[PDB]
Amino acid sequence: GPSTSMENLVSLQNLLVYVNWSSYPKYEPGKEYNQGDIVEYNGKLYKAKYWTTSPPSDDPYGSWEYLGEAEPT
């Protein structure tokens, strides 16, 4: 079959719904996270800057980027 380049495959990590969203998945330890990948953490929303594997907390090298929170106030 044909190929397709991408980055934020966090969606494929679970399913490929039609809505193309259905609320992004939550931080799941033990799964490679490519650049662009976004996951929910404690009601938050982070995005992996570059290829990296680790839970959200402190990115001294810039492995994550807070884009917002799951539920805005």
Side-chain angles (χ1 to χ4, degrees), residues 5-52:
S5 251
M6 74 217 293
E7 315 179 5
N8 171 264
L9 54 139
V10 70
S11 176
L12 224 303
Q13 299 190 9
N14 301 97
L15 225 81
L16 50 138
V17 285
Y18 64 90
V19 68
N20 208 55
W21 168 49
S22 216
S23 233
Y24 294 138
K26 286 146 129 148
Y27 137 72
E28 246 215 39
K31 238 222 228 261
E32 253 86 50
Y33 288 111
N34 324 71
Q35 76 297 90
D37 287 22
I38 300 127
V39 309
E40 176 179 350
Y41 186 78
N42 287 240
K44 222 119 151 215
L45 270 179
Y46 302 93
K47 171 149 104 175
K49 313 199 137 198
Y50 74 116
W51 217 74
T52 312

